[model samples]
Target chain A: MDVSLPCIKIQVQTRYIEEQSNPEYQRFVFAYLITIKNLSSQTVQLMSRRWLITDADGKQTVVEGDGVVGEQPRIKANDEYTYSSGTALDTPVGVMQGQYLMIDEQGESFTVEIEPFRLAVPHV
Target chain B: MDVSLPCIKIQVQTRYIEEQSNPEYQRFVFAYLITIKNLSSQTVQLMSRRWLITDADGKQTVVEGDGVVGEQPRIKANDEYTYSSGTALDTPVGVMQGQYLMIDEQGESFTVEIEPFRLAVPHV
Candidate 1:
């Protein structure tokens, strides 16, 4: 499928790590899988990531990393790159929104917004 | 060794890849080892790299990459990170210089200049 130029779609799947989380002690662990799909004709490389994270308690945090999962992968046209990573929070439920800094094949830099995604216990 | 605040030392070691180079086709291959040494107190992460390369034939080219060797490593105080990567040139000799875009522990961004280095075939 062809997408608009410079377009990238963000897909996320999350699950709570029951064995690693201690709800009673207020530690929650979650794993998230990310798929970065590139619809642009030119290859793009991920440069950095900026994440805005929040918990149910209204705690706000900003996390910045040079690359995802220790890699700055190049996504060619019609290709997708996927990786799994995790986070920990004091609350059982939290949300994350982020942006990816990328450079296209021509050296033009841009960003891809990552819509908010949820991390919560199955029942609560 | 302790360097000045926000200081980074760039060291490069290059060797000609004779087996992979075809002088008849004007293609020369070289492998270079890069060492990024952080002398500052704060940990710094490499964001991107910009290179200016030129050959004896007066051909100038600019190469940009999101990260080095697919990884953007965090170099802590008095620490160092190293990786090897290769480049191909149409000329037998060339020079390269560049700068690294980096962010320190406190989120301050800075650049480390890479001094010009020679890339020449042995005994040429």
Candidate 2:
């Protein structure tokens, strides 16, 4: 994915966990979907990225790089890419925020920013 | 988990996928472990959070809030909390990042930051 292009959209939808099945600790299951549009004329090759996840208790985790575990898609003009991902939370409360490290054909690189979202548990 | 506590650590270790089993896309199975330490004297109650996931393709996903599905963990002084999670990738390259929302006693609220990490796929 070319970083010089327009903003890419990243979203995570957490389907609350069932209390009866698993109790004592609050659990959160989130599914994420991302869409990247090719705004540049030339096809951009996506290389790799990094992520940081923090819980309500202030615990932080930093993920380092390599390519994504999938295909290296060459996005053409106006075309888009999308995928799904999920995270299980021990506590019903917390937020996640981070970015993507993108590169182009000439080996140029840039970053796109992602907003932090919420993890809300079900209350019975 | 309480927001008044010190920093909590969140880490996602993505093990490389076996290409023969799953090909065509970059499939990443990340197991996450979280450690939360309580720095307060009194007990703190955690409520909910949000997450924003961005990919290398410039796609962005925003997650909303609620409580964790597991047991309501009342983290006291020097106590800790942890768990695991994972996500799959359509492409062999990209990154994931985000944060957690927290609450404390007396209906008070706070937020903790989770730094952005990288997602790197293996090369043949």
Candidate 3:
């Protein structure tokens, strides 16, 4: 079932970085901003992340990392965390989704889903 | 700046509809469920929507219409609206993003950003 509440909530925004993209060479770049909020009553610390990135050619790449951007953030109840990152693709379009491994103040761990988001070049 | 709060908040979840997909013909189908929460204190009514969908082949399609699932939903302060929709692609992956036209109780109109989301067939 969809258990979004009583857990973490995520919001995403993406932009096509035209200046960083080279359509001639089939290189398209996108920048995305993510906001993660602690919706539950408990505090939680984001430990790690995993992303499933799919390019226009149907090639899927999994990116696993320690933390976002650089630091592992601990969010308190009703508080939010934000970060920015960018991705490159061989085509004008791609898709990405993943999850964050988190631990509560009690030391219990859980996975917070980062619902799939898009990376695409805007129509000129 | 990104002012997601004091406005409408959107969350998305997507799943590949395997039973309805035909990989042989490159017809990949996906179902997406959305939850729109009224983060503002004002009540709002969703009036219309616009989506920019891009396939793995670099083809982009724009879909615009009134309301979602054939009905406009009015969300109250601190409340939310949820709906489900599906899309088919010519490839195993694609991306979708759009905005919702909404009106507050005071008849003030605004656009709620539906951050880009991914549509992909799982790796087998």
The lDDT leader among the candidates is: 3
Task: State the lDDT of candidate 1 residue by residue for A22-92, as single tens digits.
Answer: 98999999999888877556789999999998998979999998899899999998899999998899999
Compare candidates 1 and 3 on TM-score and give the better one.
Answer: 3
lDDT of 2 by residue, B69-97 (tens): 45446676557665545445555455655
Model 2 CA deviation exceeding 4 Å by range: A1-7, A17-23, A122-124, B1-124
C-alpha lDDT of residue A67 in model 2:
53
> For candidate 2, what is the lDDT?
0.53
**How many backbone collisions does model 2 have?**
85
Model 2, residue B101: distance off in Å is 28
Reference-based TM-score, model 1:
0.48
**DockQ, each predicted model:** 0.01, 0.02, 0.02
TM-score to true structure, per model: 0.48, 0.41, 0.51
Show where candidate 3 strays beyond 4 Å.
A1-124, B1-5
Give candidate 3's error at residue A21 in angstroms: 52
Question: Which 10 consecutive positions of candidate 2 chain B have the poorest summed lDDT?
Answer: B1-10
State each candidate's chain A TM-score: 0.93, 0.70, 0.92
Output the lDDT of residue A39, model 3: 66
RMSD of 1: 15.8
